[PDB]
Structures are given as C-alpha cells and as structure tokens.
C-alpha cells in the first residue's frame, strides 16, 4: 500500500545550468550501473534539401575516430571498460548515451566530450560511410513501417523540412563534402542548446565536477547570427499512395492534428491512445478483449495488427493509426476505425474512460523502468518543457480528466478534420479519400 505515498517517494531530478548555457540534470539512485547521455536539438528539421541527411552522417562519423584517439582507440578503450554506447537521431532530437558502471564514469564523460566536439573528418571515412549508408538505405527500403512513416510525413508537412526523413534523399547524401558537415558541426552542436543528463549511483555535485572539468570550456559561441528557430510547420492534410502489387501484406496509416507539448490536450489524447493503442495477432483471449476495435478485428479477422498512437513535435504533432492487413479487409478495418473514433467522440461513457485512465497509468509506469528510458524521458522532457515534471503532478493531471473534457478534445481534434492518409502495397481496396472524409462524421 501507500501508493500515493509511493508516488510521493519518487526520486527527484536535480536540474542545474552550467555557465556555457549547458543544461545538466541528474538522478542519483542506488544502482551502480548508470547511464549518461547528451541530448541535442538538431534534427533534420533544421536541415535543408541540400543539407538533408547531415545529422545522420554525422552520427555515423561521430564514433569513427577523432583528433585525440583516432580510428579504433575509442572503441578499444570503451570495450576494454565494458560500457555500451548507443546513439539515435530523429527529425527533432539527437541522443548519444553510454550505459556503464559507477567506476568507469570519468573516462566515459571524457570520451563522450571527445566524441561530441573533437570530430576529425578524413576522406576514406566519408567514402566508406557513404557506400555503407547507401547500402543501409537499400536494405531499409524493405522495412515497411518506416517507409510508411516517411511517406506520411512527406505528404503531411509539404514544404517544411519536417516532411524530410532523417536520412534524407540518397542523392544529396552521395554528393557532399567535408565542408557542409563542418558547417553542420559549427552551427548546430552548441553549448547553449545541449543537455547533459545522467542517472544512476553518482552524485549531482560529482557530475557537476565532471562537467566543470570537461563541458566547461566548450564552443559556447555562435556564428554570424545564423541560428535556427522553430518555424511554425504547415500541416496540409492530404493523401499519398504507393501501389505495388507484389507484397503479401498492406500497410495503411492515417493521421490527424497534434497537440504539441504544452496543453493538457496531449494528456487527453494519451488517454485516447490508452483507450485504443496497440494490438498484435500473437495474443490470447481475443474473443473477449476490452477494446471493441480489437473485439471486431478478432471476431471477423480484419487485420494482422494495428496500433493507434501519438507522435509529437515542436508545437505540433501527428495523431492516429497504423495497421497491417490483407488487401481484402481494408474497407471494414477503416469503417470500424471510424466507428470507434465517433463512439469516443459522441458517446464518451464511464467505463471506457476509467479503463483508459488505468491503462495510461500502467503505460507510464511501465515506460518508467530501467535507467536508460528514465534518463531519456528526462532529456527529451527538458528539451520539450524546460523541466522534468514529477510523477505526482502527472498523476494529478491524469486525475483531472473526465469524459466531458475527453469528448471536448475529441470534438476538437477528430470531428471532421482533414486527414493525412498514406497507403502502401496492394492497396486496391483502399477506400477513396472523399468517402473517408464523409465517414469522418456520421450525422445520425
């Protein structure tokens, strides 16, 4: 028991700011295994069409040598100390973290600095990584779900660089030089906009000391006022389809507007995703499932799988569904999807909102386990809020949700919106866009 006191007993993230504009944050816990990361607000959204795929290629050459320990001494020392290095880059954010132990920590922070700022760039490296990343694009022309997301963003944010992918087009990647990558490093990886966050058995003043050694004395100095700022992206709302009739399955995604990050509409739409969310056909008890969309999709075998989901971005986002199905059941899947949406919109009842509250509490608590997801949520929250709001206030904002505000938000963001519809595969029996728009509301 004492579960409310258990949410009161959640440890707090000590957040401070180092003198170069550095945003530092720490969770001092009882685990000797720790995780230390750097988060950077430089995605493909700041890239242009001739700068597309910059940060991805920088990520692939952030680890392949430096001016201090070139080529293989970095990997040799890290694998000599048993730490695991990981990195990802998105359209908006880019993270570099190390999963290590409490007695490998200062070498980890020092080599993290050496990875971030001291990137020397040869030409055998750019040739080799150009070839291998073009092989990567050739191989990831097969993983269907990321292609669906790329088609969806490209048809959703037409003109803004949010429609671009992380890797960008292959043709700009296969023709660059050192100079544009150097401009990327000089313009984007900047001490005022970067966040050092760590979690584990290590003191906040100890990490303060390590930052005062290494991350005090970074660049901290912009170029001739050539600085990025979030332009308000123009969500058009349209549809793209890629008919290709040699595939066994079909992938259909649909999306509507986003809440952004600030309003509690994000909380209400996470309640909506806790209502529906995911289903895969490797489960049990299918004929008795709680979500009625899953009930119909088991009882009549509509799809292979689905998930209704949220993705957010700076002051915007996409909200909706992605499903994998055979070509003979696209129409009924979409019909029951619209039916479940309008049942949430016009008939927000008691027990479904109760179950959504419980499922969203469970989803948040299950998301917060392990040092890496917690520190990752810390870093991306401080790049989206300026604060890590603790879980008690999260529970308060969940507890301030009733079905009335739910159907208010559902009338605001679902009731006759202009969608983005991406179809991929054998999509002959995809319903037409005007029929989908007519099915976005039923008058009866």
């Amino acid at each position: 028991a004492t579960y409310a006191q258990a949410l009161q007993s959640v440890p707090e993230t000590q957040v401070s700011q180092l003198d170069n504009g550095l945003r530092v944050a720490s969770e001092q816990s009882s685990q000797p295994t720790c995780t230390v990361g750097v988060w950077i607000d430089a995605g493909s959204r700041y890239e242009t069409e001739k700068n597309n795929g910059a940060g991805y290629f920088v990520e692939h050459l952030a680890f392949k040598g430096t001016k201090n320990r070139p080529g293989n001494a970095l990997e040799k020392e890290v694998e000599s100390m048993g730490a695991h290095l990981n990195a990802y880059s998105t359209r908006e954010h880019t993270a570099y973290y190390i999963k290590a132990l409490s007695k490998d920590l200062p070498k980890a922070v020092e080599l993290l600095a050496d990875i971030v700022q001291n990137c020397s760039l040869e030409d055998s490296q750019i040739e080799k990584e150009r070839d291998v990343i073009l092989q990567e694009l050739q191989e990831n022309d097969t993983s269907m779900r990321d292609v669906v997301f790329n088609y969806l963003h490209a048809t959703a944010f037409q003109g803004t660089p949010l429609a671009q992918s992380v890797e960008g087009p292959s043709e700009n990647v296969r023709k660059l030089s050192r100079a544009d990558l150097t401009e990327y490093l000089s313009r984007h990886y900047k001490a005022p906009r970067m966040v050092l966050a760590a979690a584990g058995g290590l003191e906040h003043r100890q990490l303060l000391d390590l930052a005062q050694k290494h991350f005090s004395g970074l660049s901290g100095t912009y170029d001739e006022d050539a600085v990025p700022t979030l332009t308000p992206c123009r969500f058009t709302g349209s549809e793209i389809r890629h008919r290709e009739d040699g595939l066994p399955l079909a992938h259909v995604a649909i999306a509507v507007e986003g809440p952004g990050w600030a309003n509690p509409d994000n909380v209400a739409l996470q309640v909506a995703n806790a209502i529906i969310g995911h289903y895969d056909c490797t489960y049990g008890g299918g004929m008795h499932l709680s979500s009625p969309l899953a009930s119909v999709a088991v009882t009549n075998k509509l799809c292979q799988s689905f998930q209704t989901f949220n993705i957010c971005y700076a002051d915007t986002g996409l909200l909706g569904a992605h499903f994998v199905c055979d070509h003979m059941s696209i129409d009924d899947m979409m019909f029951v999807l619209q039916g479940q949406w309008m049942r949430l919109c016009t008939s927000a009842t008691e027990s479904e909102v109760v179950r959504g509250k419980n499922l969203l509490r469970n989803a948040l608590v299950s998301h917060l386990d392990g040092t890496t997801p917690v520190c990752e949520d810390i870093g991306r929250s401080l790049l989206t809020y300026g604060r890590r709001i603790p879980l008690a206030e999260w529970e308060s904002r969940i507890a301030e949700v009733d079905a009335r505000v739910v159907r208010e938000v559902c009338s605001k963001y679902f009731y006759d919106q202009c969608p983005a519809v991406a179809g991929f595969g054998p999509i002959e029996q995809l319903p037409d866009y005007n029929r989908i728009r007519s099915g976005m509301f039923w008058l009866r």
Binding site: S411, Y415, L443, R444
Partner: protein, 57 residues
Amino acid sequence: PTLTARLYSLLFRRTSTFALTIVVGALFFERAFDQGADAIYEHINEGKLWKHIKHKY
C-alpha cells in the same frame, strides 16, 4: 470572414442545430421569395393585371 468562422462554429457542428437552421431558413426563404415573386410579377406589368382594376372597380 471572421464572422463566417463563428457562423460555422454555431450552425454547422451537429445535426440537430444544422437541421433546425436549414428548416427555419427554408421557411424564411419561402417567405422572402414569395414576397419577391409577388413584387416582381405585380411590378413588371402595371397595366394589365387583376389588382388595379379590382380595386378601382
């Protein structure tokens, strides 16, 4: 066009308000078109119809 926006937000959201709007507008449109039809039809001739020589006679 800001006045058209609150017009959408008042009279085109649901079905009941929309239906009441189009019914009341249909009756007022009936009223206005019948008055306009009477006016144009008894305004174009002015020397033939039954009205003037039904009040003068």
